[PDB]
Amino acid sequence: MKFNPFVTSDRSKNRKRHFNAPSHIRRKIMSSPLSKELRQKYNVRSMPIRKDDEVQVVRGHYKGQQIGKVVQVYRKKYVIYIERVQREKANGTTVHVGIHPSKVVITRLKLDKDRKKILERKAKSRQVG
Amino acid sequence: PKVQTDPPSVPICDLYPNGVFPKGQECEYPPTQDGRTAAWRTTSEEKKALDQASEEIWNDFREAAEAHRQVRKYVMSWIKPGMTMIEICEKLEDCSRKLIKENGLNAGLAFPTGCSLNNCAAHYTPNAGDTTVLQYDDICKIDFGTHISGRIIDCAFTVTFNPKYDTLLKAVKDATNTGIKCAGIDVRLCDVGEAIQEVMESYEVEIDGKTYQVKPIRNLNGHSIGQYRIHAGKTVPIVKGGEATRMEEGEVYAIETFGSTGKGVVHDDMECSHYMKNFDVGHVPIRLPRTKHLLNVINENFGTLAFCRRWLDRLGESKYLMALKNLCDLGIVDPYPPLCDIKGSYTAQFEHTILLRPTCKEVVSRGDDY
RNA sequence: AACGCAGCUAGCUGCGAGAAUUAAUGUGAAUUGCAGGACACAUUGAUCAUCGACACUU
RNA sequence: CAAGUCCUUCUGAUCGAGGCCCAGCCCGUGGACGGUGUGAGGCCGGU
RNA sequence: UUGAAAAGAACUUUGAAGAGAGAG
Ligand SMILES: [Co+2]
Numbered sequence: 001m002k003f004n005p006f007v008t009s010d011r012s013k014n015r016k017r018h019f020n021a022p023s024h025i026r027r028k029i030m031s032s033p034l035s036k037e038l039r040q041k042y043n044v045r046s047m048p049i050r051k052d053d054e055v056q057v058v059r060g061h062y063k064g065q066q067i068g069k070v071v072q073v074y075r076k077k078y079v080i081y082i083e084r085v086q087r088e089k090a091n092g093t094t095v096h097v098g099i100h101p102s103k104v105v106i107t108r109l110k111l112d113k114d115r116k117k118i119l120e121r122k123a124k125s126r127q128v129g
Numbered sequence: 130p131k132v133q134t135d136p137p138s139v140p141i142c143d144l145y146p147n148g149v150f151p152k153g154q155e156c157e158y159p160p161t162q163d164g165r166t167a168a169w170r171t172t173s174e175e176k177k178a179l180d181q182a183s184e185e186i187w188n189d190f191r192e193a194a195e196a197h198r199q200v201r202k203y204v205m206s207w208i209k210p211g212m213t214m215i216e217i218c219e220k221l222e223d224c225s226r227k228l229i230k231e232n233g234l235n236a237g238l239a240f241p242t243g244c245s246l247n248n249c250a251a252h253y254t255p256n257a258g259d260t261t262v263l264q265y266d267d268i269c270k271i272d273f274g275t276h277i278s279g280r281i282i283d284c285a286f287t288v289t290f291n292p293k294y295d296t297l298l299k300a301v302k303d304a305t306n307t308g309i310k311c312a313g314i315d316v317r318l319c320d321v322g323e324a325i326q327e328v329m330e331s332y333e334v335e336i337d338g339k340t341y342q343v344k345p346i347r348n349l350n351g352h353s354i355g356q357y358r359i360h361a362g363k364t365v366p367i368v369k370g371g372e373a374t375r376m377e378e379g380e381v382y383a384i385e386t387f388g389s390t391g392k393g394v395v396h397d398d399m400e401c402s403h404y405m406k407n408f409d410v411g412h413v414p415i416r417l418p419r420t421k422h423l424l425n426v427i428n429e430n431f432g433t434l435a436f437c438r439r440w441l442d443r444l445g446e447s448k449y450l451m452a453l454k455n456l457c458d459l460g461i462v463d464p465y466p467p468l469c470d471i472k473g474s475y476t477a478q479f480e481h482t483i484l485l486r487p488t489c490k491e492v493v494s495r496g497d498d499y
Numbered sequence: 500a501a502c503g504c505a506g507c508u509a510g511c512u513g514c515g516a517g518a519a520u521u522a523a524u525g526u527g528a529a530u531u532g533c534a535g536g537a538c539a540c541a542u543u544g545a546u547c548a549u550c551g552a553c554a555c556u557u
Numbered sequence: 558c559a560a561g562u563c564c565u566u567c568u569g570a571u572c573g574a575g576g577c578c579c580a581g582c583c584c585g586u587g588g589a590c591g592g593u594g595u596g597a598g599g600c601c602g603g604u
Numbered sequence: 605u606u607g608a609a610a611a612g613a614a615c616u617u618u619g620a621a622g623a624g625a626g627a628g
Contacts, residue, residue: 002589002604009604014591018602024526024547029592029602033562045559046601051528058562060570060594060608075546076531078592079609090614090628092370093347097609102593102601105562114527114540125558319615370614396534472536 026075032101038109043123047109049073049101054108055082057099067107074098137203140230141196150191153484153493158313161320167313170488180487183379187491189280190381190484194493196228196275197284201498210265210290214244215255217263218439221273229275234432239274239281240359241403241437245467248474250346250387250395252403253467254437266291270478276434279357283383284494285480297334297388297477300343302499304329305386305479308351308367309492312384314485317373322366325386329367334390336475346387346476348395348468354381354482357433358408376485383482391474401466404453405435413459420452424461435465 002009021029031046032055039045049055054067068082079098086094109115130146133139141150158167170176203224208217221242231237245253246267255261263269272285287298304325311324326345334341351365363374367386376382406428415421426446427436441449456462470476479499484491 001587004589004604007589007604009590011590014603018592022547023529025602026547027527027529031601033600048527059600063570073529074531075529087609087611089611092368092614095611097611100593100601103562104600110528112528112540118527122558129558373615398535 023075026078030073030075030078030080030101032104032106034106034109038106042119043126044119047106047118049080049106050110050115052110053106055080056105056107057082057085057103058105059103060099062097062099072096080104133199137199137224138227141192141199141228142230144195145192148188150188151195152191153194153491154495155486156310156490156492158490159311159316161313161316176487186280187484187486187493189277190282190482190493193229193275193277193280193282194284194482196225197273197282197494198496198498199228200225200273200275201271201284201286201496204271205288205498208288210263210267213255213260213262214246214269215259218242218244218254221271225273225275229277234279234357234434236277237275238434239276239283240405240435241440242273243270243285243403245270245272245476245478248389248391248470248472248476249398250349250389250468250470250476251478252401252465253399254402254439256400256402256438257442268294268475268477270476272478272480274359276357281354281357281359281434282482282494283354283359283480284482285385285478286499287477287479293336294475294477296332297336297343297390297475300329300332300334301386301388301477302479303332304345304367304388305384305481308365308384308386309481309483312365312376312382312483313490314378315375317375318363318365319369319371319373321384322368322371325367326369329386329388336390341390343388343390344393346389346395346470347393349385349387351385352383354383355408359405359435378485378487380485381482382485383480385478385480387476387478389470389474389476391470391476395468395470397466398469399467401464402437402439403435403465404437404457404462405465406431406433406456406462407460408433410460413461415455415459417452417455419449420455420459423449423452424456427456427462 008014018029027048030049032049032053033039033046034042034044035056049070051070051073053070055070056065056067057063062085066084068084070080070082072081074080077098078100080101081096081098085097085099087097089095109119131139131143133144145151157171160166200221204217204221207220218241222238225238229236229238241254243251243254245251246261246263246269249270251270251272267290269288270285271288272283274281274283276282287301289295289298307328308321308325311321329343329345332343334343345367347368350367352359353361353363353365355361361380363376363380363382365376365382365384366372415424423446426444427441430436430444431440438450438453441453453462454464457464481492481494484493
């Protein structure tokens with residue numbers, strides 16, 4: 001049960017902010033869980049998705065064991081693109097299939113200056129508890 | 130019959146005063162007849178008889194292809210990084226003019242020499258004042274053509290200096306050769322697209338620590354050549370899912386093939402330089418004296434063949450790109466601006482012109498180089 | 500209230516000749532219909548938000 | 558700033574249906590809500 | 605208020621097309 005008087009639980013209100021959200025906010029909902037190996041080593045459960053991360057699909061028709069890299073983070077449609085997540089168009093070309101970030105697992109992170117700082121900040125909050 | 134000098138200057142006809150010019154690679158048509166081979170027309174039946182009925186037409190293609198071979202060997206001889214392609218194009222054009230001994234429209238250059246760099250694919254030639262020095266880490270597509278009495282031959286290759294591109298070059302060359310062997314008489318164009326895509330995609334490219342997958346440029350495709358008509362109206366594709374039209378006896382084709390480490394599509398990027406009068410349009414009124422003058426100049430000097438702004442400045446005409454775009458809007462001439470891929474991508478092209486002889490398939494543009 | 504401002508732009512929206520935004524701060528790799536442009540991301544920066552500096556046609 | 562995308566099974570996809578040593582999967586000062594290819598405390602934002 | 609996702613119907617054939625018949 002939520003006790004904060006200034007946070008609403010209204011269905012329409014919550015939906016409106018989710019569908020009408022600025023991109024920098026949308027990145028926060030653009031979050032995916034790390035695999036067990038990153039989670040144990042980084043002590044972090046979930047991370048926002050990025051343009052180049054090794055990503056594994058765990059739900060849907062394309063669910064499998066193969067590892068792929070994100071190639072586009074389409075924040076407008078709340079989807080991302082991996083290489084081998086494709087289907088065959090009618091004429092003959094090949095198009096990507098949008099997969100929601102919550103339905104994938106990050107197997108390798110785009111280790112970067114801002115990134116490296118992000119994990120240790122989340123991780124150091126764990127030893128607080 | 131004399132011999133050619135070390136810097137090629139002797140006209141091809143002088144090398145073969147007899148009139149017969151070296152034949153291309155003769156190849157039997159594919160055994161696509163459900164296993165049955167086509168090695169039944171090589172016998173000198175009426176097939177060969179009606180082949181002889183068009184012998185004089187072939188000889189023009191043979192001499193044009195020989196001239197192309199000597200010109201491209203000469204270009205390969207001295208091409209090196211650090212020199213701009215304005216002088217490269219000048220050297221190629223003047224050597225081709227001397228070797229073909231152009232005279233009006235009976236002989237000359239079929240279209241401007243294309244030299245596309247890096248992500249650019251085709252239909253780029255430097256204009257006046259274009260200061261672009263070549264680099265060691267560059268790839269260039271040398272596409273140029275010559276014709277004899279309108280018998281156009283179109284051939285293209287790719288030059289590299291950094292040895293990191295040989296994988297892509299060999300992939301595109303294999304794709305082009307597979308398209309060559311797959312082509313034949315009474316075969317659908319979708320089949321050749323199938324073959325080209327299934328051979329070319331099974332290659333991997335490792336450039337600068339990044340692994341890319343080579344893919345066809347689905348936008349470009351081959352074409353059929355006509356009498357003074359570079360594009361006869363038939364396009365052989367290089368991707369799956371195309372038309373079901375057949376190739377017939379007595380036709381000639383340019384089996385082009387493009388491969389890019391990019392998105393596989395191209396768009397117009399920089400200033401247009403290639404232009405082409407429409408073969409089908411008839412008489413369209415013009416209201417500008419300058420436009421009329423330029424139109425009659427180009428139809429006298431370039432006819433229906435493609436031309437570039439360098440070829441117009443070479444003729445002493447200035448202040449003309451205005452009337453040029455005027456003819457473009459009037460629909461007389463169609464601009465062909467350069468086609469380019471994503472920045473940082475690389476493109477390779479290999480092209481050959483093939484002949485559908487009644488008895489066999491001759492790739493007249495074949496040479497020892499490629 | 501009027502009139503203008505987008506590479507392709509009529510309406511809606513935002514903006515004011517610095518005209519679908521400038522600066523600064525936070526954030527931290529996109530925007531997206533297409534193309535182009537980007538993008539060491541600290542020898543410091545896309546987008547978004549905030550908004551205290553600047554500017555704001557009749 | 559907590560904890561299942563564990564196993565078997567329904568599906569086009571599932572958040573669905575069974576099971577989860579110790580009387581009972583794991584967290585619970587968190588079982589409000591929303592999103593995610595049904596219906597989700599434990600996938601994600603949050604709470 | 606299509607559809608989870610345009611995957612918005614390649615290609616062949618009749619018609620000048622709108623419209624069909626196959627196919628996907
Ligand atoms: Co060509």
